[PDB]
Design a protein around this ligand. Structure first.
Ligand SMILES: [Mg+2]
Lengths: 256, 253
């Protein structure tokens, strides 16, 4: 556990991966219900050309048993030994598969920070300012980086509001602010790109991750190098996801 | 000559190619100075995967000699027998390599129409309203389609102005309005895409082609299926024709 960050090139370096420099990094997510399912996925992903491995812990059936989470994290880390591992429990409020109280959610993340098996944790911006601040501090004290997140699965907020949220994430100490929004029109995709550009230009001093969801928003997953998003999600493995192989092809074609 | 057009799906069909439907089409350009150069380019492009061949006539040294231009169109057509051929003299004012009087430019396009060898001509929006109306009429009377164009190589107009130009092209009878603008900032690229969406959804009853130039605007060359541009330019920072098709296919699903 040790990561670096620079406000000159606006980068975060974890496990030798420099987020915020060069081409957008590909994040793939593990969604298994059991420990063996998580291993099957990790084995299947090991060959794929991705950069960061995200474990969606809300899909894990035994998330309330500390020993089981630790065992599954340990199993992933022994299959994917050199790529950064991001621990993500998506809350029910923001589309996650299970529900946990605020207290449990914070304890889960603190336990993931303690394990030494994860390089990063995902904390939701709207969890509560006191709780967010406390958990960011704890993660940082253990050399664990924080991706702070916010999702709107049904609409796209005004560009100014998207910018405001990303700024608040920086205010709260996020190492990498992250926002995903849902377009209802084609203009909404451009609104998300506008917000990304404005944030990068006016306020960002670290990498940021942004996305417009659905088939309509797929260009937001491809044009990060120009518009300013530092990472993008792909499936190894709906009609609005793009395969990791195809994402890598496009990113390479667009790389400058 | 023969082409079709439909305001239902907003398409123009020329030599079996349906512009405005499915994935955006790829236009490649011939830039040769001599008929021999033009022939070599066309031969080299013949086995590339592109949809429309554009002849950039302003690059042609013998443009003022009517028989030379006709012989060169004939030579291209012998090599590229199945793809639509777009005849384009880019004027000096809009970045073209040579200068012609308005009259000479109109005579050149009329001669192209008369040849029967070209499927489409490019006419510049700002050529002059009387001349544009007369030449669109002439092309149409001979079943030649018109791509009406406008370029700004140094800046991006306001979104409303981009839309206004595209609407004016429609009003003047363009089969396919086309605009290419240069971004000075990242936001300018988004302004071009915004204008594209606005035009296509609110006013267009036919295909439109839009582009934000430079490496910064590459996304405008890839995302036409969603935002509304019907075609994009490639060559056989710039993305190649092979790579362009790869990405367009990926986005088409
Ligand atoms: Mg169309």
């Amino acid at each position: 556990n040790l990561y670096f960050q620079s406000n000159a090139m606006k980068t975060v370096t974890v496990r030798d991966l420099v987020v915020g420099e060069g081409a957008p990094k590909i994040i793939v997510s593990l969604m298994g219900k059991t420990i063996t399912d998580v291993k099957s996925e990790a084995l299947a992903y090991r060959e794929a050309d991705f950069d960061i491995l995200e474990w969606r812990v809300d899909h894990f059936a035994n998330v309330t048993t500390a020993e089981s989470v630790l065992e599954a994290a340990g199993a992933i880390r022994e299959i994917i030994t050199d790529k950064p591992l991001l621990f993500t429990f998506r809350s029910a409020k923001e589309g996650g598969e299970q529900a946990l109280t605020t207290g449990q959610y914070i304890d889960l993340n603190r336990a993931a920070v303690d394990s030494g098996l994860v390089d990063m944790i995902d904390l939701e911006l709207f969890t509560g300012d006191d709780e967010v601040k406390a958990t960011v501090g704890y993660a940082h004290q253990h050399n664990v980086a924080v991706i702070m997140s916010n999702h709107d699965f049904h609409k796209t907020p005004a560009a100014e509001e998207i910018v405001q949220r990303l700024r608040k994430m920086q205010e709260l100490g996020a190492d990498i602010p992250k926002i995903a929004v849902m377009p209802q029109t084609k203009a909404d995709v451009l609104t998300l790109l506008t917000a990304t550009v404005e944030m990068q230009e006016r306020y960002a001093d670290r990498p940021i991750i942004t996305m417009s969801m659905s088939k309509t928003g797929v260009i937001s997953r491809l044009a990060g190098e120009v518009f300013g998003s530092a990472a993008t999600f792909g499936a190894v493995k709906a009609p609005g996801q793009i395969s990791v192989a195809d994402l890598r092809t496009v990113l390479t074609i667009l790389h400058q």
